[PDB]
Structure formats: C-alpha cells, structure tokens
Amino acid sequence: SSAVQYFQFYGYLSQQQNMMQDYVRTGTYQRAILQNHTDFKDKIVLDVGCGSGILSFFAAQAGARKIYAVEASTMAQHAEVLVKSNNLTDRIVVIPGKVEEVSLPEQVDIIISEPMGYMLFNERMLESYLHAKKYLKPSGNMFPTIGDVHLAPFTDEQLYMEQFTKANFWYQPSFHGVDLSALRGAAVDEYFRQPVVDTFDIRILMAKSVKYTVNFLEAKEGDLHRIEIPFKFHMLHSGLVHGLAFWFDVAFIGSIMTVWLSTAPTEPLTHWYQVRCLFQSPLFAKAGDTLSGTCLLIANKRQSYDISIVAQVDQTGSKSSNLLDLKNPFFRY
Amino acid sequence: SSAVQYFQFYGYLSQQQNMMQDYVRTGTYQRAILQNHTDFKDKIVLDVGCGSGILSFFAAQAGARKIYAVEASTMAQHAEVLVKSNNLTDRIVVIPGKVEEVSLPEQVDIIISEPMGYMLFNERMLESYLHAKKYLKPSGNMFPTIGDVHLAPFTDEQLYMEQFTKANFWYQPSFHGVDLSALRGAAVDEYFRQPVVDTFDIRILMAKSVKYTVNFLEAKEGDLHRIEIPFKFHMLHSGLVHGLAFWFDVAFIGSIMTVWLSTAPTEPLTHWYQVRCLFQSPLFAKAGDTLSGTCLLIANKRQSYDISIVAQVDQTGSKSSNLLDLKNPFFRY
Numbered sequence: 001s002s003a004v005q006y007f008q009f010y011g012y013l014s015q016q017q018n019m020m021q022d023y024v025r026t027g028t029y030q031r032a033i034l035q036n037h038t039d040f041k042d043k044i045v046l047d048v049g050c051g052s053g054i055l056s057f058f059a060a061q062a063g064a065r066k067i068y069a070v071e072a073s074t075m076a077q078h079a080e081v082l083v084k085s086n087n088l089t090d091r092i093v094v095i096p097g098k099v100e101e102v103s104l105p106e107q108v109d110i111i112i113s114e115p116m117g118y119m120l121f122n123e124r125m126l127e128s129y130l131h132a133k134k135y136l137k138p139s140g141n142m143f144p145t146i147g148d149v150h151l152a153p154f155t156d157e158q159l160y161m162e163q164f165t166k167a168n169f170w171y172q173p174s175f176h177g178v179d180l181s182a183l184r185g186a187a188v189d190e191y192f193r194q195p196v197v198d199t200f201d202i203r204i205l206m207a208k209s210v211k212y213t214v215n216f217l218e219a220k221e222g223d224l225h226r227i228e229i230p231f232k233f234h235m236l237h238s239g240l241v242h243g244l245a246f247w248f249d250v251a252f253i254g255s256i257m258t259v260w261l262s263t264a265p266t267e268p269l270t271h272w273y274q275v276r277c278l279f280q281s282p283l284f285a286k287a288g289d290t291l292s293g294t295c296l297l298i299a300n301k302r303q304s305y306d307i308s309i310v311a312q313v314d315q316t317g318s319k320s321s322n323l324l325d326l327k328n329p330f331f332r333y
Numbered sequence: 334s335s336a337v338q339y340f341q342f343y344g345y346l347s348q349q350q351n352m353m354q355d356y357v358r359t360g361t362y363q364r365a366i367l368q369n370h371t372d373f374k375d376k377i378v379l380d381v382g383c384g385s386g387i388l389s390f391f392a393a394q395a396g397a398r399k400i401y402a403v404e405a406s407t408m409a410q411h412a413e414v415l416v417k418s419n420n421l422t423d424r425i426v427v428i429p430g431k432v433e434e435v436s437l438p439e440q441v442d443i444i445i446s447e448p449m450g451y452m453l454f455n456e457r458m459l460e461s462y463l464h465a466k467k468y469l470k471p472s473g474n475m476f477p478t479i480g481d482v483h484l485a486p487f488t489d490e491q492l493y494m495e496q497f498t499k500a501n502f503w504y505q506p507s508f509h510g511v512d513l514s515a516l517r518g519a520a521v522d523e524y525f526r527q528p529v530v531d532t533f534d535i536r537i538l539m540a541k542s543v544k545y546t547v548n549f550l551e552a553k554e555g556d557l558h559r560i561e562i563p564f565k566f567h568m569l570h571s572g573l574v575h576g577l578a579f580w581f582d583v584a585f586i587g588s589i590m591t592v593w594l595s596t597a598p599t600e601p602l603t604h605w606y607q608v609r610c611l612f613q614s615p616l617f618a619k620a621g622d623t624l625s626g627t628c629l630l631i632a633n634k635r636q637s638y639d640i641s642i643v644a645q646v647d648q649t650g651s652k653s654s655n656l657l658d659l660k661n662p663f664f665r666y
C-alpha cells in the first residue's frame with residue numbers, strides 16, 4: 001500500500017522537476033558519466049527508475065550503444081516523449097514496470113540510477129538498485145559504485161529547546177475549559193522521535209565523523225533490511241551532545257576517474273540537506289572523552305526505517321537513547 | 334491502503350494541534366454546543382472521530398449525562414489521558430475503533446463531529462458521520478446539522494499565468510544537452526488539474542454564489558459517492574472567467590439558536606481556506622451574461638474526489654472544462 005503511494009508520488013512531473021532543480025545532483029551525475037565516457041561508449045546500460053530519463057540521455061551523450069530505461073510510475077510515458085523528441089529511439093528503450101518484474105532482452109555492462117533518499121537509505125530504492133544486478137555482466141560496473149554514511153555528534157540547544165516550544169499548545173492548563181497539560185509529555189516525546197531534515201553550521205559538530213560504507217557491487221538486497229553502525233567518537237569539543245548528525249556521499253568509480261556526490265555540511269547544499277536525530281536527553285562530554293554506541297536502522301513496511309540510537313560518554317557512564325521514525329521527518333529548512 | 338495512511342496521519346498529536354490552533358473552528362463549535370446547552374443537558378452524545386476529545390469536553394461542559402467518544406487512530410489513547418486528567422471518567426467513555434465496527438451499549442440523543450475537509454467533502458469522513466446515524470434515536474439531532482457548498486465564477490489572470498510559470502523548467506530546449514520542451518504541455522496540464530487551496534480578494538468573484546445543501550439528518554452515506562451540482566450564474570462583472578471558487582458553511586441547528594461556521598472569503602480565514610479550480614481555458618463573459626454548467630464530484634479510492642467541471646457562456650456558446658484531482662491540491666497560501 002505504501003508502495004502504491006510511492007509510485008503515484010513519482011508519476012508527477014512536478015516532483016521530477018523538483019529533484020531536477022538540484023544543480024549539484026544534476027551536474028555531478030553528468031560529470032561522473034561524461035568524464036568516464038570511455039566506460040559508456042559502445043556499451044549496454046540499464047537505468048533503474050529513470051524518471052524523466054535524463055541519466056539515459058547522459059549515457060547516450062557518452063556514446064552508449066543501447067540504454068534500457070526502466071520506470072514503474074506513469075513517468076515512463078513522459079520519458080518516452082523525450083526519447084522521441086531528442087531523436088534517440090535507436091539507442092534508448094523505455095521499459096514500463098518494476099525492475100523486479102520486467103524482461104530485459106540482454107545483460108548490461110553498467111547500471112546507472114539515483115536511488116538515494118534521506119540518510120542514503122530512505123524510500124528503500126537501493127534494494128531495487130541491488131536487485132537489478134541480476135542483469136549485470138560479471139565484468140560490469142554500477143554508477144554510483146559505493147555509498148558512505150557519515151554520522152557525528154552535535155551540540156545545538158536551540159534545536160533541543162524547540163521540541164518543547166513546538167508542544168506549547170499542550171502545556172495549556174485552561175483551553176476553552178479543558179486542561180490539556182497531561183499530554184505535554186506525549187507531544188514533546190513525539191517531536192523528539194522526528195528526524196530533523198535541515199542544514200546547520202559545521203561548528204555544531206563535536207568530533208570527526210564515523211563512516212559506514214556500502215559497496216553496491218558486493219551488497220545484496222537483503223543486507224539493507226537491518227543496518228547496524230557502531231561508533232566511537234574522539235570528542236574534540238566540550239559541551240552538551242544533543243544527538244547525531246547524518247549525511248552521505250556516493251562515489252562513481254570509473255576507469256578514468258572517481259567522481260564524488262557529497263551531501264556533507266562542508267559542501268554545497270543539496271535537496272538531501274542533512275539529518276539530525278536527537279537523544280531523549282543530552283550528554284555532557286569534554287574534549288578528549290569518547291562517545292560510544294550504536295545506530296541501528298531497521299527497514300519498515302512504510303518504505304522507510306526505524307532508527308534506534310544509543311550512546312554513552314565512556315568516562316562518566318552517562319547514557320541516552322532514542323527510537324525515531326524516518327517516515328515522519330521534521331522539515332525545518 | 335489510503336485508509337491506513339489516513340488513520341496514521343490523524344494519530345499524531347502534531348496534526349491534532351494544527352487543527353486545534355484554528356480559533357474560528359474551536360470557538361464556533363464551542364459556541365454552537367454551549368449556546369444550545371439545554372439540547373445537551375442530561376442527554377446521551379456520540380462524538381464521531383473525537384481526535385483529542387475536545388468536542389466531548391464541550392458536550393460535558395453543557396451537562397451531557399454520557400458521551401461516547403469514538404476514535405480509530407492511536408489518538409484514542411491520548412483522549413483517554415485527557416478524560417482522566419479532567420476528572421470526567423464518569424461521563425466520557427472513549428471507544429477505540431471505527432464507528433462502522435464498534436458496539437455502543439445504547440442509542441444517543443445527538444451526534445457531534447468535525448468531519449469536514451477541503452470543499453466540505455474531501456477525506457470522505459462525512460460518510461462515517463452519516464453511517465453513525467444507526468445509533469441516533471428518531472428524535473435525535475446532529476451537530477453540524479446541514480452543510481452548504483458555495484461555488485462562484487472567478488477572474489484571476491495571475492493564478493492562470495502561474496500555471497505556465499511553474500512549468501518553466503520543462504520549457505528548456507537545452508538542459509545539460511537535453512531538449513525538455515516536448516513535456517511543457519504535459520507539465521502545464523498537470524498544474525491545471527490541481528485544485529488551488531488559498532484565500533483571495535472577494536473582488537475576483539464575478540457572480541453571486543450557487544448553494545448546494547446537504548441535510549445530514551436526511552442524507553445517506555451512499556449519497557456522497559457522486560455529487561452533481563448544476564449552476565447558472567448571473568454575471569455581475571465583465572472579464573475573463575478563469576474557473577470556479579468553492580467554500581462551505583455548516584449550521585448547528587439547536588433548540589435555542591442556529592450557529593454557523595462559514596469558510597467564505599468574506600469571513601475570517603480558517604484552516605480550510607477556499608478552493609479554486611481552473612478551467613482548461615478562460616471564458617469571456619460580460620455583465621448580464623449567464624454562465625451555465627455542472628460541477629460533478631466523484632468519490633475515489635484515495636479518500637478524495639475527482640472534480641469534473643464544464644461551463645459555457647450562454648450568449649456566445651464559448652465553453653471549457655477541466656478534470657481535477659482533490660488528492661493533489663496546490664497549497665498556494
């Protein structure tokens with residue numbers, strides 16, 4: 001049912017336009033494909049979830065002999081219009097349907113896609129990307145090739161305090177003759193369980209990031225159902241740790257060069273922004289302390305993830321945790 | 334599946350808070366119940382879709398002997414907390430579940446609810462409100478008692494022109510080596526099929542409104558599957574008619590007085606705003622002409638309506654039409 005809502009959403013030209021207006025996303029994919037044009041020239045390509053078809057056009061710009069553009073939403077009909085209007089019906093073949101269900105007439109040299117969501121994994125499309133390797137020749141490549149999830153402890157009492165302010169409605173002991181205040185705790189708890197999608201000043205980061213790498217050439221679809229990221233941070237700053245900040249990079253590892261698409265808060269902003277998950281209660285750390293714990297991502301039936309975080313300051317034993325739902329993010333930007 | 338998404342959405346305190354922050358909505362419901370307190374005192378009440386429970390508290394404020402508060406979402410657990418904290422467990426009974434499936438131990442004197450969506454009918458909750466009359470005594474009442482949908486022709490070339498501007502991305506004949514322009518027509522057509530939720534200056538209205546009344550005491554659940562609203566407008570202004578504007582009123586017809594909740598653009602703004610549906614092409618009308626046609630609402634499987642509009646200027650024969658999806662509104666406010 002969540003899957004019906006997902007494909008309906010991506011069938012709108014307005015949504016495809018929104019994503020295509022991210023100039024870092026467009027420019028980095030085009031650079032990755034075209035700087036590596038020798039990897040595409042005279043090759044067979046699969047574009048998984050082609051949307052508008054623009055990655056298939058970039059593969060054609062690089063001289064690919066045949067591109068299969070697979071799309072499950074009504075967007076497949078719009079991609080076919082662009083293939084005809086750009087005079088590329090000899091080299092781009094649009095296949096309507098799910099990459100899990102369609103028939104390709106041949107194996108491919110390289111798979112291209114944009115399957116990344118918030119915190120890399122949101123919307124679970126990387127599972128369809130990995131599934132598509134059933135069509136990849138043993139010698140074949142995938143663009144993107146690897147994904148790096150970064151997480152770092154942050155300090156931000158303004159974000160922490162806002163969770164209480166947003167619930168101010170429920171604090172009212174006398175609203176049209178009703179005491180609402182018994183729900184203040186539940187309302188604040190609900191806000192704390194929303195991952196925060198926005199950007200921030202890099203100075204809120206209190207330690208160098210921990211990196212978790214997924215190699216898309218090696219990973220199996222089932223690997224992404226449960227993602228466990230242990231961490232030990234070497235604290236560089238003293239203050240309250242309010243939670244963990246997340247971002248991701250992908251690398252396109254070509255024969256000619258490796259091209260990175262970074263969503264780090266040190267890099268130009270993208271439509272992925274960054275994601276912050278609060279602890280239920282902040283932890284005091286001094287520079288030189290270690291903050292250890294685990295971030296566990298469990299895939300759910302709403303095409304998203306439940307996020308379990310636990311952290312302790314090793315030197316004091318101070319600990320906190322949270323359980324968040326990436327289906328219900330707070331868009332704070 | 335749409336129904337799962339619907340009940341998940343209303344289970345969040347953040348959504349209930351959003352609705353409860355509409356001071357016209359809160360104040361008008363409280364006034365309707367309490368000015369008519371003699372209708373509630375010592376009576377049995379059913380609150381359909383109680384959310385936070387606040388209408389059940391208003392019924393208790395009016396001296397109701399017993400209130401059954403029915404709620405299908407996880408909000409039922411929060412309403413029960415408020416009933417306990419307000420010391421009303423003797424008079425308010427929270428029943429978790431769908432009003433279509435639960436067991437009430439007795440018939441009720443009056444049904445109260447807030448079942449109204451955009452354009453009155455959006456989200457299809459009025460069908461559950463009417464269903465609940467299986468529990469109403471023959472002598473019983475419903476608050477609200479009637480609903481009036483208003484529609485009027487409007488002139489607004491800024492809104493019409495925006496539909497083209499919003500698609501400017503697809504006009505590009507050279508975007509990273511791709512001609513996008515063959516999709517400009519499809520993108521503009523998609524924007525025209527989105528009902529526009531916003532408010533506007535009353536001077537864009539070119540005729541007195543046509544009123545379509547639903548009497549909730551008489552209406553059957555099945556009546557709302559297909560709603561056909563013929564119209565003939567007596568044009569008061571000369572210019573291009575770009576579409577139809579919609580709003581609604583509900584009346585609470587008590588023994589002591591009738592209280593109105595109006596979402597008209599002459600009245601203080603509410604969270605319902607107003608809704609505008611463009612024609613595919615504008616119609617020139619002069620003052621004294623008549624604009625005739627039909628607005629047809631067909632309920633769909635996404636808890637919303639397909640909106641078919643047809644209109645002609647009687648004096649010229651100029652005609653236009655559109656088919657819109659109220660599931661995909663443009664929030665322009």
Ligand SMILES: Nc1ncnc2c1ncn2[C@@H]1O[C@H](CSCCNC(=O)NCc2ccccc2)[C@@H](O)[C@H]1O
Nearest residue numbers: 010026029049051054055071072073098099114128
């Ligand atoms: N199992 C599946 N089988 C088939 N289609 C599936 C499956 N899972 C998801 N989908 C579709 O995947 C799309 C993700 S959104 C468009 C991304 N591609 C895009 O913008 N390409 C152009 C571009 C330009 C520049 C830079 C990057 C990308 C949607 O249309 C889904 O309907």
Ligand SMILES: Nc1ncnc2c1ncn2[C@@H]1O[C@H](CSCCNC(=O)NCc2ccccc2)[C@@H](O)[C@H]1O
Nearest residue numbers: 343359362382384387388404405406431432447461
């Ligand atoms: N078949 C159904 N059975 C049971 N519950 C159902 C069904 N269909 C929908 N629902 C629920 O109905 C609510 C609509 S939103 C809350 C409206 N009530 C509210 O604010 N009351 C307080 C208030 C205060 C002031 C002014 C007006 C109202 C949701 O919680 C749904 O989950």
Ligand code: NA
Nearest residue numbers: 189192280281
């Ligand atoms: Na807590």
Ligand code: NA
Nearest residue numbers: 522525613614
């Ligand atoms: Na048209």
